[model samples]
Target: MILDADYITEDGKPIIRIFKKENGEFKVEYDRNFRPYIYALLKDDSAIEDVKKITAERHGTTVRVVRAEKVKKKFLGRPIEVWKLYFNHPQDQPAIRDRIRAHPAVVDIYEYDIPFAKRYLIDKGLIPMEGDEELTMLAFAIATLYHEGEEFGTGPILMISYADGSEARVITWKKIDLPYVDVVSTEKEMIKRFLRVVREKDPDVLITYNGDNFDFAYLKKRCEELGIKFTLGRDGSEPKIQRMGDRFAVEVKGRIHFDLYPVIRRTINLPTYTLEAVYEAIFGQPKEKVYAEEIAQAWETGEGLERVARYSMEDAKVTYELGKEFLPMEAQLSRLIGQSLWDVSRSSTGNLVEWFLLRKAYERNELAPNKPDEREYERRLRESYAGGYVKEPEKGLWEGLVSLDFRSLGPSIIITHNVSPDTLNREGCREYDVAPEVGHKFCKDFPGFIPSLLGDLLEERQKVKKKMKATIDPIEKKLLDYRQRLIKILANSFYGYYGYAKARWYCKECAESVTAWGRQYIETTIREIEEKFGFKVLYADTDGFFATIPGADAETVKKKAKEFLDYINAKLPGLLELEYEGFYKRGFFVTKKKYAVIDEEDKITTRGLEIVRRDWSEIAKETQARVLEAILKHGDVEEAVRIVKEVTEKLSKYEVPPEKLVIYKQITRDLKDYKATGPHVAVAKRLAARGVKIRPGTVISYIVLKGSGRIGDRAIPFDEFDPTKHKYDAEYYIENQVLPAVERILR
Candidate 1:
């Protein structure tokens, strides 16, 4: 007797179910298939007519289905029992359970069971061991289902495969619906059974998707609610859970839970991380489709419970199979990442050292925990800026007005100039001066000292490289070498460049430091460079420094700048070496800065001509690039315009609908301030007034105010000035301001 079940509940009601399949294929019944059909019908034009006919017939009608009777055990070689139950409301659990049990064929039913709270002392190798309390634990909690272990908590799954190819398995404990965990059901009991089985038949390893962080964490929490001691050993008597506080520690005594998601991500190129997506990508199978609203209606009617059960079973099976298929990949990646970590840990490569420093900073209060978007070093940089520390430039002259540049300016300025990493406490927050203190303390503590951690690591990295090169396995050697280089790059740039915005380590201190340091570094470095190089340093920002020396006598200034670079290199005592990234004809290149551009040599084109603003719109940029390219090829502006219009028409069909025109408005401002609105702004405003909506994020072209302009009494900023003036049209601006600026700076 094979049974398939789907669970449904009312709005805001949590639904759960238990299914028993004696042995057979699981699939949705006819009535339950309507949801996917309806979805497909709505999305595809060809299916619409058929869907409409079916919907009209089914509308206002309730679906009624009879429950199948349980078959006798003797008739079938292996008697299969299948049952589907529905819970309409969250609070009405008892009534549903009684009805499920009263069914003639129902032997046992279970809701999902999640693990309880526990802790373990994990070693550096990420392996759990006894009496290793002194070692730091890296938390990796599994958040999904677990089958085997003590009945006290949700345990991992267990499998027994016979020589004949028959396999016996049990459902593990799944995550609970709510935060608190005091209730019990057949689900909990089934979980206990799985745990009992695990004690009887222990497996070498347990696997889950992101289970270490999400699934296991939830399980350990449930254990705390029940005051249950969780364990996972050959016998239930060997309690494994070690509790610290509310959450479980990383290391468990008996079993190791491996998360397959990260391992898969590092190894395979799947379209998505979900079980269904993984199966589809790997096996080229279509995923099972079900609709949320239909499930809700089914719970109300009590007709679609079996379909829901089928969906759940499919999910579990697919996830399990995916885990099995990629087990070897997981092992290989685990070993590779493990070896890389070990090598870095011993070598003090700049990145690894930075990690330790970051950990320490987190432990103290000096540096704050990272925000979801901002990395730790970025946060530190921001903090440094708020505290007021400037980054020093590589070279410059006095009285010549040098353009100042901050080196790895964002990160370095943030950490050294703003936030104090040394002041952080164990709780991951600061107690004292915090942000500003970080900069002052860093400067004071290190003085002229440079970060040599990466330098030391490079020395060790060489050994790792040599050893890896000698290995017989090309894959292993290549991966190791890549890891080595990646780690080195990461360490070398950690505090210097500020962590990337999307990096896991992003934080507020880094953002502030980068901003503040850039500003101050520019102002101060400009002054210093002017005096040292006898050249005038002009506008400077977060990246490259721009300087102008008298082209008539630029040779002396260039020689002095080179001398200063050597002086700084010899004077600064760090394991790392700073090289001359490049030099423009008239500008200097600060390689580490974002948007660094410099002149190659001394060359004079024009004075006071610069690109004060730039416009960036996907359509605008592409159109302009295409038009320019076309004009260059055809040598006719008219032809370019026609080609551009054709391109725009093709793109417009695929482009998102426009709603807002503010971005376009902003872009126009970057061009120049016009006495009145430009052609683009006027068109946008006209369309908007006429009820034409534009996409909110779309960018548009406009002008900026340079000399003077006012709409009423409001004065426009130079960058925002609309530039439709005859003197500053697109051709003129490019030929005069933009081109000259580029050439002069690049010279």
Candidate 2:
């Protein structure tokens, strides 16, 4: 498998094809058999020997033409063996492969004796059954593609420069002496040349741009028709490139053909990844003068052929540079996802395909790829329907409900209460302030302990402020890092609805402690409000006390609720803050026993104002605005209805969009939940969970459930349908449960 380097003189300018090998080695090879072919097609050959000498000297090798033999001409079926030579190396396999590939007369190449087990391991990322031989072979192949600068397809010479100031020039299927020209007589010859390169190079990885789909498939088809053996393994049979899916495949014999396009697309957040796009994104410049598409056209157009050659060379160069960008990210992303970068890279090609594979591997019991048409959607619908609804309190109704939200509760108990084995009080200390109330709260609510829990659950997280004063372990030192990250995430979330909502997963201890101590704080404040301001306290919930000053004297009630919250916060030293989270300046904080709405417009002093709840989506905001505008302008139900029609003409054309309709229906309940009618049920539920108490007939709108794993689209919407449809629409009455037979019987 030895061959002398090809070289030629074009207008007295010398040119040569440099052959690179695995093991970071290289040499020169001139295809003597291709000299006539090049002379006929390209009219050059004078510098061929000079190139040979230069390349030989560069790699510390001597070029010797041992002899020439005649064989059947590859394209014309004439016998020819142009020339033969050998290079000595620590490992001659790479040298042999490169020589065979470089020889112009060598129509095809094959490698025999590669084991199947090695191929399987490299391709599948499985433990190699055959061990290091296969591993080394696979590694060699990868190195060949990565470092040797081998590429697919035949084209003319081209050059490219990278952002790092490195440049590469390549001549495609042309005589070494000539600048750029395709001399291969037929597609069969082109495929043969490519096969020869792969066989001789013995690269660990056979890299290609869509080689699995286009290059290899085309080569396979051509070989089948030509009746030539495409073997590169021990059996002298066609090597099987196993297909993982539509986008991914692996060659047998541990010769991995990595497709570059898929790998780059999936891992990086780049503007685009078409070679040209990659060039622009990475280097902020156009790839080359001529685009890839111009290659074929340039070959045909004699005047434009040089440009085409230049572009072809540039493409190879750019491909190499882009590979540098892709490989590391691909490796990282693949490791993170627990898949080969090659596997994850395919996700860029098709999300559904990625999902299908993940569903197959990750959720085998729940998903069957082969049984895609098995009516799973119908099965899911059936399950949802059969689950049967549980009547539950709506979100944001905690106001009327005496929510016994435990304060810094979970972490507090984990810290001050010492719930873990390593803690100071692990064996239970009678000396600590382990109140029955707090201990009972912990038994019912503390999250299961795990050492691996990071962030807020990290070891000695509560002693963070103290730890900064006297530091120890760097690992333990990450508590502040965790806190900073959480604060950033929490603060960022408030601006844009990006992550989890507040009610979906509140810190349970925070909720519980707030509920338990918060109830005490609220009751004490309420008593003071009644005694000091002479206002009748209509409701006292976990966070605030709602009192009415009788008649429409809003200022007195507002001042009273604020003062009471402040006085209570003062009573508890470092436990609480009486800061007003929100108040209705325009709309009254209605305390009609169990109903409420913050008159938001009162804050702006606008008449006929609308109260927009914080949870409403964009469509709700738009619909509510139009509805309120109509009511404000028309002043009556009939005129408002007409105005609503004019405002909602677009919606009337089709089914009103669900969000708009949902918001409209929600406003009908006026943002009040169970508390409006029989809020005692909600009060009882909240109290039972947190061990708090509250009187019946207290009016409040909503409750916030802490951490039920409900998030995003799964969040429960406010029941906003018309109360008249209470029986038909579950939203009208807490999933269709009946109103209590005797409302406020406890009161």
Candidate 3:
């Protein structure tokens, strides 16, 4: 079974290198046979149409275009003729695409920017991790040093662990000895020893929390600076730092460098995408915090060293556990997308959907649209469209509400109306339905490419689900469940795919039409539930509504919602049905998209609330949590206000530590200059002044201290703040952070 794939240069030529696991050992396989080609459409009345006729000089080489053959491919669902131009090597694509585009006859090019590794997988139909072989993954973590407040270099400790958190091995520059840990005398020795550990373990996958931008990058930099070889790769090669659009990918040759940061950052919505936050989100418990500044002091000696080493190793363990959690999802997405697992694990939802469509398009001989140029991107980015409808939510607390949700609302709308680029206002085709606001018409009789793909997934979804039902074996059932879930998730992503500005089939009308229909259906459902069924709708948002009979209890609402699901589903459009989402014991709606709900299980789910976000202090978050608990769970509005006042009084009475009052904010971009520097920006400036790379997407933790100047002056960073010596401003926390957060709930 293949774990990952990447292109490697051998004998001055690019070759395909794939990481595989067979029997018991990890191995690498190289293929030099498969060639690279890109599609192009020539304008009508062009002088030449044959591949053999096209030739260009490149770097003293005679033939830039190795071969070109006319092939029949579809564009936007209609068959079109194109030239498949074969190239000498994958590396020549940039120059080759540029050279061909300069020709007077070439009007367009497609699939020119796809990576050679991805192209190989697509052409061969090779799904990553083909078999049920249990992959071996090692989680890697680094504890970095901080001088004063800024990041200095890689610290004394480097930790690695098995996928399930066991067999954790520590390679540290610390002089102290520990169990299953090797102690190196210097930082250089530690780096070398860590590389040795990696090669010795020879794990198929190497996991890291934020390996690309942080850990692996620094590790490689440290090794390079010390004149040491990072020989972690199977063939004793250095991990290539490949530029992937805006970010970077640190690829270890012949092995998978599976970074969980981006995957968690994209898939899991949390207050912060930091490892501890995601760890808590996934496993229901957060790992202990060990601030960066603490690392150097801890590394010097004593219990400090022990705690730091333990914390370092725990990070690796937690990341390994997270890897285990996401591995199935990673492999399943890769299988569905027909791409390598390494790429899939790191890809955003938008990229995954695009790859899925590309593979599907290739299977149908459909040509991809050209990669969006700057001008085209700007044009589409400026093009506006109305999004999903949200009915005005009735404010304040309500009891016994059961939510009705439309299953796969957007996707169903796309399929039901044949909403796609090709089907939108097709000449002579029967109108499916005119969109409610946009009035865009799609063909009802003909299936669109996106709709057709969704249909296939849905059809296969039925088969997998049926298999799941028939199988009693847990493992078999789980595999089937993964299959079904991947399909559903992929199908759900298709609606968003259309709205993506750079999509191959980026139809604004199609997206607008889908939204318009979504609004229509949701409004209709609301009307039926309220007017026809005599239920009082409390709140409605896009695809779901919270509603109940005027005086109904939880039990009554549950029963009524079941009846409503059956009655309404019978009359709904194709693939569109009302599903009973949940019956809430009580719900407090503050405003549109902002509220708190408590189910019978006593579990609280908050939306758009201050407590649910990352910026607020721990005290404020806790206060809001308790405030919602008081109002919705117990119907004690007075108690909620009392609790808020109590928290405020406590803030003044007690000397609050920085930990409870720390405010977290992510640096949105690298600042050349700030017009009005916020606390986060101010801190970033100080770090930048200290010669640390204060890059974008860095989550800065700062606590406001009692001071006389601007807020930024008072904002002390987490790593530098000493609880015993410093005091957080009680007035600021109570007046700005605490009271405002609870005001709506108190109302």
Mark the regions of model 2 whose C-alpha exceeds 4 Å error after superposition. 1-189, 226-228, 231-252, 269-272, 289-296, 333-344, 347-373, 377-747
Error of 2 at 239 (Å): 5.6
Candidate 2 on 19-133: residue-level lDDT in tens?
2232333223432322111101111234234323322222355433222222222111112222222222212323344444454544333221112222222223332111112
Provide the lDDT at 168 for model 2: 38
lDDT of 3 by residue, 1-747 (tens): 888787767765778987788887777788898778888778753544543456656667665677777899778877899888888788777766876776678887789888888888887787787786887788988776634433434432343323333477667666546685677677777777677767777787898888897778877777766788888888778988878766888988777788998888767766667778888888886688887656655644445777777777788888888887787777877888888777788777778888888888878787888757899888889987888777778888788878888888987888888888888887786556777879988877777888898888889899989999999999778877988988898898777777788887888898888888888888888888787778988888999989989776667777877887888889997999888788788888898888888888988898989887888888999988998887777778888888887887878986554568888888887686456788888887777777655767677888787867789888866767776797778889998899888887777
- TM-score, ranked from best to worst: 3, 1, 2
Task: Residues 366-385, candidate 1: write the lDDT tens digits.
Answer: 22232332464455445433
Model 3 stretches with alpha carbons more than 4 Å out: 9-14, 25-30, 44-46, 49-59, 144-166, 184-192, 284-288, 298-304, 473-483, 552-556, 672-677, 707-710, 723-725
Error of 2 at 248 (Å): 6.2
| TM-scores of the models, in the order given | 0.33, 0.31, 0.92
Clashes of each: 158, 63, 1
Give the candidate number with the greatest lDDT. Answer: 3
Q: Per-residue lDDT for 267 in model 1?
A: 49
